[PDB]
Amino acid sequence: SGFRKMAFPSGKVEGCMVQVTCGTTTLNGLWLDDVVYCPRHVICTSEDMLNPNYEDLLIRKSNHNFLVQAGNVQLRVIGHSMQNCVLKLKVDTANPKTPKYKFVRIQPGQTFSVLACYNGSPSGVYQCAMRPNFTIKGSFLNGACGSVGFNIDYDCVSFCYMHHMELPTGVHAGTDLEGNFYGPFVDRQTAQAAGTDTTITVNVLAWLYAAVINGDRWFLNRFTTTLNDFNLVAMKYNYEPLTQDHVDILGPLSAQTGIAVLDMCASLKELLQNGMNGRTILGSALLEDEFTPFDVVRQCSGVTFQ
Amino acid sequence: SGFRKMAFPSGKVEGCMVQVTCGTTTLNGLWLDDVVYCPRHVICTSEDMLNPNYEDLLIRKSNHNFLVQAGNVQLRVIGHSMQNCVLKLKVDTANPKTPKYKFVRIQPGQTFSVLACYNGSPSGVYQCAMRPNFTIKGSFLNGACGSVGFNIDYDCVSFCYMHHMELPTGVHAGTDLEGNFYGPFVDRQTAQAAGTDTTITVNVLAWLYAAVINGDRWFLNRFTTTLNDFNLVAMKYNYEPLTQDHVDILGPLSAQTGIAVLDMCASLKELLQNGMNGRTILGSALLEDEFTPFDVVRQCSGVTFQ
Numbered sequence: 001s002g003f004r005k006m007a008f009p010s011g012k013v014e015g016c017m018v019q020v021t022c023g024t025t026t027l028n029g030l031w032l033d034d035v036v037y038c039p040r041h042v043i044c045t046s047e048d049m050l051n052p053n054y055e056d057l058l059i060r061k062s063n064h065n066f067l068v069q070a071g072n073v074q075l076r077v078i079g080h081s082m083q084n085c086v087l088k089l090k091v092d093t094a095n096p097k098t099p100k101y102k103f104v105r106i107q108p109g110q111t112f113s114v115l116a117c118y119n120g121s122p123s124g125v126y127q128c129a130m131r132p133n134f135t136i137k138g139s140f141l142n143g144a145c146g147s148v149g150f151n152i153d154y155d156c157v158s159f160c161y162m163h164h165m166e167l168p169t170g171v172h173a174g175t176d177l178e179g180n181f182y183g184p185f186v187d188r189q190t191a192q193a194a195g196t197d198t199t200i201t202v203n204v205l206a207w208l209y210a211a212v213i214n215g216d217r218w219f220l221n222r223f224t225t226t227l228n229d230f231n232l233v234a235m236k237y238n239y240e241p242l243t244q245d246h247v248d249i250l251g252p253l254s255a256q257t258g259i260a261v262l263d264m265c266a267s268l269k270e271l272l273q274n275g276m277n278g279r280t281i282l283g284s285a286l287l288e289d290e291f292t293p294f295d296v297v298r299q300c301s302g303v304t305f306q
Numbered sequence: 307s308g309f310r311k312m313a314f315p316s317g318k319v320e321g322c323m324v325q326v327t328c329g330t331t332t333l334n335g336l337w338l339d340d341v342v343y344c345p346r347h348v349i350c351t352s353e354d355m356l357n358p359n360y361e362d363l364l365i366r367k368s369n370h371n372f373l374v375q376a377g378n379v380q381l382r383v384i385g386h387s388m389q390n391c392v393l394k395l396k397v398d399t400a401n402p403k404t405p406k407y408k409f410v411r412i413q414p415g416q417t418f419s420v421l422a423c424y425n426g427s428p429s430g431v432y433q434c435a436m437r438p439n440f441t442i443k444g445s446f447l448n449g450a451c452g453s454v455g456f457n458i459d460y461d462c463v464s465f466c467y468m469h470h471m472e473l474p475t476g477v478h479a480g481t482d483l484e485g486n487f488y489g490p491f492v493d494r495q496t497a498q499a500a501g502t503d504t505t506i507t508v509n510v511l512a513w514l515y516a517a518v519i520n521g522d523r524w525f526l527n528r529f530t531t532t533l534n535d536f537n538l539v540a541m542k543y544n545y546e547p548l549t550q551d552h553v554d555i556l557g558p559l560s561a562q563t564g565i566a567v568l569d570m571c572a573s574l575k576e577l578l579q580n581g582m583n584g585r586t587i588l589g590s591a592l593l594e595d596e597f598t599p600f601d602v603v604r605q606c607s608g609v610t611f612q
């Protein structure tokens with residue numbers, strides 16, 4: 001029993017983290033086989049960043065201008081290119097600790113673990129969601145750029161995020177490992193704001209199933225609703241629409257608990273309209289929307305990774 | 307910016323996790339040099355556990371009765387002994403991935419990362435506090451016994467917890483790595499309950515400093531209090547007393563923000579007496595007491611580990 005915000009074990013990713021220095025700019029890189037991936041603004045000075053011509057700044061750089069260190073070992077850069085907002089430094093050594101891996105672009109609503117790094121060294125690991133507005137609620141100081149987010153499937157590390165920037169309200173924005181930004185953000189120091197966020201409804205229902213599984217059942221009412229009459233109430237409280245796909249994804253938790261998805265929707269509708277009257281669910285006084293149906297199953301069934 | 311419940315990178319501990327089977331009981335072990343440490347109730351059947359004579363059950367076991375696997379490799383047990391509630395299995399292979407390490411018994415109030423494991427395989431990592439009542443608010447299913455909690459200091463893994471049991475209310479109890487229980491718990495299936503818990507005051511103040519650092523300042527009032535007049539109010543709300551030691555430990559955060567500890571105590575006193583009137587601090591609608599002053603500094607200054 002118990003329910004915690006739980007990250008993936010970080011060991012497979014720790015073995016891939018390096019320090020990339022270009023002039024006076026240092027940040028983190030990801031060393032997979034004989035390539036180091038980092039944010040392309042490693043090639044900027046802190047004033048270049050107002051409006052940089054990246055293609056131009058890169059022209060002016062030789063392989064030796066990039067200092068890549070993996071612990072006390074310097075790796076020799078023998079090639080360099082730009083793929084969207086990500087630099088690729090071909091190095092002369094294949095990473096012996098390269099795990100089995102994939103590059104994935106995740107969808108809004110999906111979670112991942114962030115391995116926060118400074119100077120190519122891991123600081124800590126936490127779990128995040130890709131928000132409907134394509135931000136994450138991260139913890140990153142100056143130096144964390146190039147930190148990555150990932151999922152583990154048994155032996156396979158699925159890289160989905162590389163950290164680039166911090167937006168007003170202290171939320172974070174970055175790229176997939178092909179260097180395309182999540183959401184409309186650009187890698188330049190200008191006025192950018194997150195769209196208004198929404199609550200990830202399917203995730204709140206998954207968390208309510210987690211509460212039932214752990215014995216926290218006070219909020220279950222005796223009613224049902226139609227999908228249509230749920231999504232009208234949801235809309236008022238800035239909850240994203242629940243789709244039939246979402247209902248199908250909640251199938252396992254619904255079957256395990258014997259509570260129909262539309263019955264749980266009836267309980268969430270009452271919580272949204274009446275609030276929690278000072279009660280908690282799984283220790284929390286606010287509805288949680290950063291656990292996916294898969295995250296709930298993993299934690300409440302003990303799925304492991306090699 | 308941002309503030310997250312952040313675990314230590316788990317890679318150093320992942321390399322030490324093994325599966326220990328004795329008959330029909332499987333759980334996790336910690337492989338350091340040529341010793342595997344596990345909970346001693348690996349030697350019980352699920353009915354032995356009502357009231358086991360451990361010294362007796364162990365007499366009856368030969369080295370070959372313990373099946374230790376590290377991935378697809380079987381490790382040969384060549385010796386076995388009991389140290390309090392922990393088994394030590396001497397194996398014929400020193401763990402090549404043994405990190406630099408220590409066994410520490412932590413104090414109530416201190417945090418650590420748990421690497422939750424099933425069948426010697428890591429499931430996930432999360433951060434916990436040793437509660438004043440010597441429980442942790444963990445996430446553990448059947449199979450998680452032998453999972454460990456740890457701190458990393460740069461290169462050194464400080465092992466402080468090994469998981470044994472689950473108490474009423476879904477909280478967790480276990481031992482240091484010398485096999486002595488935290489709190490009054492015994493490794494037998496009987497009626498045991500956690501003492502009433504208290505809130506870790508020094509940790510709530512550290513979290514309030516984290517909020518100020520991140521720009522969440524609405525709760526700062528214009529008043530001060532004496533330590534004595536704070537600890538009287540604290541007592542009503544089941545907060546532990548704040549000591550001068552606690553005040554000294556909050557020194558760095560106080561200096562960084564320019565808010566005297568006794569001024570922050572004045573702000574916490576008002577929050578306890580008036581509640582939060584539906585406002586949040588760092589995204590939270592309840593006061594958080596599972597971040598130490600050190601945890602706040604680490605996260606808000608970017609301390610890393612090799």
Ligand SMILES: *[C@](O)(C(=O)N1CCC1)[C@H](C[C@@H]1CCNC1=O)NC(=O)[C@@H]1[C@@H]2[C@H](CN1C(=O)[C@@H](NC(=O)C(F)(F)F)C(C)(C)C)C2(C)C
Nearest residue numbers: 041140141142143144145164165166167187188189190192
């Ligand atoms: C990242 O570059 C880094 O860690 N570095 C060490 C040297 C470079 C850094 C991470 C940021 C800093 C504070 N917290 C973080 O996570 N990213 C940037 O500084 C980022 C680079 C410039 C401007 N960046 C920003 O993050 C800025 N944001 C914005 O302009 C905006 F969000 F408002 F749009 C600032 C610094 C204002 C937060 C570029 C985007 C190329």
Ligand SMILES: *[C@](O)(C(=O)N1CCC1)[C@H](C[C@@H]1CCNC1=O)NC(=O)[C@@H]1[C@@H]2[C@H](CN1C(=O)[C@@H](NC(=O)C(F)(F)F)C(C)(C)C)C2(C)C
Nearest residue numbers: 347446447448449450451470471472473493494495496498
């Ligand atoms: C642990 O043994 C384990 O993971 N195993 C796989 C085979 C053994 C297990 C972990 C528990 C189970 C549910 N969640 C957990 O974290 N620990 C025990 O089962 C533990 C063993 C017996 C009885 N144990 C208990 O945890 C029980 N608790 C209590 O009796 C008490 F807390 F109320 F006191 C139960 C099973 C009721 C939760 C011993 C303490 C030796």
Ligand SMILES: [Cl-]
Nearest residue numbers: 285286591592
């Ligand atoms: Cl909360």
